[PDB]
Amino acid sequence: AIDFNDELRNRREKLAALRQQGVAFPNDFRRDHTSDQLHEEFDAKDNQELESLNIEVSVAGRMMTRRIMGKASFVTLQDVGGRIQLYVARDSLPEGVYNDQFKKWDLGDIIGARGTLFKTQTGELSIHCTELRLLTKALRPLPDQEVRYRQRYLDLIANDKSRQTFVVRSKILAAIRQFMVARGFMEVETPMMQVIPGGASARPFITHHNALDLDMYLRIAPELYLKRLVVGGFERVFEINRNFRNEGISVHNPEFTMMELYMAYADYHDLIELTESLFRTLAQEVLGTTKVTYGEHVFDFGKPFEKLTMREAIKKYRPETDMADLDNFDAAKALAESIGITVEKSWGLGRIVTEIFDEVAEAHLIQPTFITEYPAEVSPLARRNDVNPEITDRFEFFIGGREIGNGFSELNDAEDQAERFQEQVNAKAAGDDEAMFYDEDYVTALEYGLPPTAGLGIGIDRMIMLFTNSHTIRDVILFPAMRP
Amino acid sequence: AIDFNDELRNRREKLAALRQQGVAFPNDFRRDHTSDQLHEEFDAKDNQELESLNIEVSVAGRMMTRRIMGKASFVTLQDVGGRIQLYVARDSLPEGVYNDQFKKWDLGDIIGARGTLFKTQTGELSIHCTELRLLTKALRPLPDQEVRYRQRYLDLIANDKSRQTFVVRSKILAAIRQFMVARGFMEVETPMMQVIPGGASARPFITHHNALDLDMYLRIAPELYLKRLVVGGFERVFEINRNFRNEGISVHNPEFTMMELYMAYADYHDLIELTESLFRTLAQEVLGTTKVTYGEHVFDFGKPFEKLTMREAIKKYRPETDMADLDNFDAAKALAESIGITVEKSWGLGRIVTEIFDEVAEAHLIQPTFITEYPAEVSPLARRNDVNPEITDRFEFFIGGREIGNGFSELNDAEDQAERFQEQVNAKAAGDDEAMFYDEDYVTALEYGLPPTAGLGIGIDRMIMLFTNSHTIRDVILFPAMRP
Ligand SMILES: N[C@@H](CCCC[NH3+])C(=O)O
Ligand SMILES: N[C@@H](CCCC[NH3+])C(=O)O
Numbered sequence: 001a002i003d004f005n006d007e008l009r010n011r012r013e014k015l016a017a018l019r020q021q022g023v024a025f026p027n028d029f030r031r032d033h034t035s036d037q038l039h040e041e042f043d044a045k046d047n048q049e050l051e052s053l054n055i056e057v058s059v060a061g062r063m064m065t066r067r068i069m070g071k072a073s074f075v076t077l078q079d080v081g082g083r084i085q086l087y088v089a090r091d092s093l094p095e096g097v098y099n100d101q102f103k104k105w106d107l108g109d110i111i112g113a114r115g116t117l118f119k120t121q122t123g124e125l126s127i128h129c130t131e132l133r134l135l136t137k138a139l140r141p142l143p144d145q146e147v148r149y150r151q152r153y154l155d156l157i158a159n160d161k162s163r164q165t166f167v168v169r170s171k172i173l174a175a176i177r178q179f180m181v182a183r184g185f186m187e188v189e190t191p192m193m194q195v196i197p198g199g200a201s202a203r204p205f206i207t208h209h210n211a212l213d214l215d216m217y218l219r220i221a222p223e224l225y226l227k228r229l230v231v232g233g234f235e236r237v238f239e240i241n242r243n244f245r246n247e248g249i250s251v252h253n254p255e256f257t258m259m260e261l262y263m264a265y266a267d268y269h270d271l272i273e274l275t276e277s278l279f280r281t282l283a284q285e286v287l288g289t290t291k292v293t294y295g296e297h298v299f300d301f302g303k304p305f306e307k308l309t310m311r312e313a314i315k316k317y318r319p320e321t322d323m324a325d326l327d328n329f330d331a332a333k334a335l336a337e338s339i340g341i342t343v344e345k346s347w348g349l350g351r352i353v354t355e356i357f358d359e360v361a362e363a364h365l366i367q368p369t370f371i372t373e374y375p376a377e378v379s380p381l382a383r384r385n386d387v388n389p390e391i392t393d394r395f396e397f398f399i400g401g402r403e404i405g406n407g408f409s410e411l412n413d414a415e416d417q418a419e420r421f422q423e424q425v426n427a428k429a430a431g432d433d434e435a436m437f438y439d440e441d442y443v444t445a446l447e448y449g450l451p452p453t454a455g456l457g458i459g460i461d462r463m464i465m466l467f468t469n470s471h472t473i474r475d476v477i478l479f480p481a482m483r484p
Numbered sequence: 485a486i487d488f489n490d491e492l493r494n495r496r497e498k499l500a501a502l503r504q505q506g507v508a509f510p511n512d513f514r515r516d517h518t519s520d521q522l523h524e525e526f527d528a529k530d531n532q533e534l535e536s537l538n539i540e541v542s543v544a545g546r547m548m549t550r551r552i553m554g555k556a557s558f559v560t561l562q563d564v565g566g567r568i569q570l571y572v573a574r575d576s577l578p579e580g581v582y583n584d585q586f587k588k589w590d591l592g593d594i595i596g597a598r599g600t601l602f603k604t605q606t607g608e609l610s611i612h613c614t615e616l617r618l619l620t621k622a623l624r625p626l627p628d629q630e631v632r633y634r635q636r637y638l639d640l641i642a643n644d645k646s647r648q649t650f651v652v653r654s655k656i657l658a659a660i661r662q663f664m665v666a667r668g669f670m671e672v673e674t675p676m677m678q679v680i681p682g683g684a685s686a687r688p689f690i691t692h693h694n695a696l697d698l699d700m701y702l703r704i705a706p707e708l709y710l711k712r713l714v715v716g717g718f719e720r721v722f723e724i725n726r727n728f729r730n731e732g733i734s735v736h737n738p739e740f741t742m743m744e745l746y747m748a749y750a751d752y753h754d755l756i757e758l759t760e761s762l763f764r765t766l767a768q769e770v771l772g773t774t775k776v777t778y779g780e781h782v783f784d785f786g787k788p789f790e791k792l793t794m795r796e797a798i799k800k801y802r803p804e805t806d807m808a809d810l811d812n813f814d815a816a817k818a819l820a821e822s823i824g825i826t827v828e829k830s831w832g833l834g835r836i837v838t839e840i841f842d843e844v845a846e847a848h849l850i851q852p853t854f855i856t857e858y859p860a861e862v863s864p865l866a867r868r869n870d871v872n873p874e875i876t877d878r879f880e881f882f883i884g885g886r887e888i889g890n891g892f893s894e895l896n897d898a899e900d901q902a903e904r905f906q907e908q909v910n911a912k913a914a915g916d917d918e919a920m921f922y923d924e925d926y927v928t929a930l931e932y933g934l935p936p937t938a939g940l941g942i943g944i945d946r947m948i949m950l951f952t953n954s955h956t957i958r959d960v961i962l963f964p965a966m967r968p
Contacts, residue, residue, distance in 0.1 A: 023870055025897045027751045027936035060749045080719035110935045136896055138933035153929050156716030170670045186654045191963050192726050193739050207691040211732040225963055232640030235564035242676050248695040255677050265544045267511045386507055412620055413509045445637050449622035451594045452511035479675050479709055
């Protein structure tokens with residue numbers, strides 16, 4: 001209780017002493033090795049080898065543990081690559097350093113060490129220090145469960161598993177890029193600020209551009225811009241970046257990372273194949289196996305995902321459903337309301353059926369699953385099905401009961417797109433706050449001619465969860481949006 | 485004039501006919517080669533070789549030119565990789581296709597072709613088509629100078645040089661990532677929406693989070709978050725993404741791409757070296773040479789950048805300056821005002837001197853140049869110089885008379901950081917609308933201990949300009965913010 005306030009006072013006082021001696025915060029020590037490198041190269045060597053090799057190295061990091069035993073001490077130093085042992089002895093260091101400096105430092109302090117590699121009696125790799133310095137005085141001791149999110153730096157210092165999660169996120173993004181580029185896709189950057197938001201249905205964030213006296217929107221999706229690029233001739237493009245949806249912070253984050261990709265002369269079937277390869281590749285290359293453990297489940301990304309139509313999923317998860325009800329507006333509305341769905345005045349049959357699917361099946365799609373036949377009403381940007389114009393060549397895919405991706409054969413029929421935008425404008429007029437805005441320039445782009453194309457959006461944060469056994473999106477986002 | 489309205493009517497009518505025949509917009513044709521691949525592999529082969537090799541391929545793209553000559557025609561097809569010639573003959577295609585379909589198509593139409601490779605009498609690589617299809621009817625004919633920005637898709641269809649510019653941008657970003665990762669840097673993602681904006685000085689964009697009834701800011705820089713990651717132990721991190729500054733759209737874009745990188749146990753000198761290697765590497769790997777032509781200049785990224793202190797730059801570009809004036813507030817204010825700078829009440833000597841440097845020297849820094857010794861007043865996040873506390877270990881670097889990067893040894897002195905934040909709060913109270921907000925959590929992070937570190941921000945859009953001979957930032961941003 002009070003012992004903490006003493007740690008603080010003690011560290012301040014030690015800092016005051018440093019200031020009196022000269023420059024309290026230097027920037028001069030240079031390391032030439034991180035712990036992981038030392039382990040990779042030297043863990044397999046016994047003390048006899050290291051003795052003859054006589055390898056001197058320099059490391060730096062946070063002093064995590066210290067056991068002072070008179071004339072000698074043992075320190076665990078934690079850097080970007082993990083931890084390495086330091087053997088700190090009075091007579092190995094320059095005169096006075098051990099007793100007048102080292103012993104006065106505190107756990108949490110950033111230190112630098114140079115010395116010779118060897119192995120302890122316990123067989124651990126260690127550095128027999130010949131030089132040791134205090135680089136940064138830590139004014140605070142080493143560290144609900146919200147603290148992890150409000151002070152992620154404390155989470156990263158303390159928890160090896162949190163660190164590994166974020167290192168894996170970076171490995172996954174790099175591997176996605178490598179996967180995409182190998183398939184001839186080119187990464188592009190489209191606006192975050194848009195005059196007309198689109199490419200999805202969501203309440204947007206609005207901001208005022210002080211200069212051009214205009215109201216701008218943070219993007220809910222880059223879709224309409226990416227398809228303009230395909231019209232332009234960039235027939236294989238992808239973008240990995242944020243979308244912003246003014247929903248709630250219900251562990252949901254207002255901003256999240258999405259990858260969208262478009263490939264001309266392909267349909268949704270090609271996206272299905274690409275999705276399966278991507279997951280199999282990521283699992284194999286990043287995790288070492290195609291069988292991934294997530295909670296109480298195992299996902300085999302080496303086997304094809306399940307494929308069901310939206311109606312098959314509804315029937316499978318609410319077997320008592322009279323499927324004929326989904327063909328009649330009144331019946332579908334009644335069914336929807338009976339399962340707790342508030343049916344808005346603007347909704348049509350296709351929207352109601354989709355909402356029923358969400359309520360009924362989504363949570364149960366645990367194993368990787370593609371759900372096809374999304375109604376036209378809820379897919380204003382998707383190609384109509386040749387046989388039944390009321391459904392589109394669109395799928396969403398789910399893993400662990402969450403939506404991971406959304407893909408479709410793109411609507412390249414400009415006149416149809418205009419009509420569908422108009423319907424969305426009518427829906428907003430009828431109360432649909434999330435309906436799409438009419439985008440004339442986008443229609444114009446389609447009039448110049450969009451090649452037949454397939455596009456896919458994949459929630460990167462959700463994907464990261466599945467590969468790191470995280471069960472809240474907040475565990476894979478470095479700095480989650482936190483309530484004040 | 486009226487001939488355009490006829491093109492439109494004609495294309496609509498042809499589309500109407502397509503609709504009557506069946507599905508006007510199919511998604512079925514699959515290609516197996518792009519033009520660039522065909523050229524790479526087959527340009528060096530003469531007609532004798534191609535005749536015996538008898539290689540059949542499938543391509544698809546926009547019909548750019550067509551010369552109909554009775555029973556045979558020549559078409560230029562433009563895809564993602566460039567252009568390839570098609571030889572379209574009545575008797576080579578299935579019955580009726582040539583006369584009843586092909587001849588009725590229009591330039592701009594997206595078409596698919598399968599056929600055998602050969603070389604024309606002119607020595608050009610061409611495809612003797614055996615199958616040809618209309619994939620997408622173009623309802624509009626092929627395309628101030630603002631149109632390029634308002635309809636970038638038209639710019640990309642029409643101008644090979646615009647395309648190449650954006651292909652190079654993507655190559656540069658990929659090469660930057662490859663350069664960074666090779667040096668042990670890990671790419672991370674920090675928030676675009678922040679409760680407290682910081683890491684730079686600029687008027688921000690504000691947006692309301694409908695849910696959490698809170699006002700949020702689009703980030704002006706990710707700096708404060710990235711340094712929290714270094715405290716956390718991610719000692720080599722970088723982020724490449726947008727910043728948003730509510731300035732003007734004076735060809736300046738409200739949102740732009742920046743790379744920020746941080747490396748612990750390094751100072752600004754290491755950033756200088758990294759900057760030089762990065763540019764030399766990018767030029768060599770992407771452009772094929774270290775000597776880069778930009779406008780009327782040539783930049784040799786194979787030779788060290790020039791290095792001048794801020795004062796040396798002022799003296800060099802306004803030689804008549806009595807340098808002693810920069811040591812006296814009144815004198816400096818008078819000097820500043822005499823060159824047209826409006827000196828605000830909140831400004832101190834360091835700010836005035838920096839403003840003088842901007843007015844006097846910035847535009848003249850054509851050859852790659854580092855400018856050191858930035859005053860403390862204008863560098864609230866930078867490490868103080870050991871000898872003179874009123875300047876910081878900070879530099880900015882310029883090329884082509886524009887600021888390309890900003891880097892410094894990081895301030896890891898928590899108590900100093902708090903004081904400097906307080907000064908920034910005072911500056912805002914005194915009228916500085918762009919002054920930094922006090923960030924308590926950031927100070928707390930520094931109290932846990934930030935290793936000595938060097939950080940650098942590089943304007944990616946400006947960098948792209950220098951490598952593509954573009955002279956407005958709008959030429960390297962796919963969809964520039966355009967006035968309504
Ligand atoms: N824009 C979609 C992803 C791409 C769908 C195919 N065009 C979304 O935000 O869900
Ligand atoms: N945050 C700086 C770049 C990094 C400077 C070094 N910490 C900027 O926006 O200019």
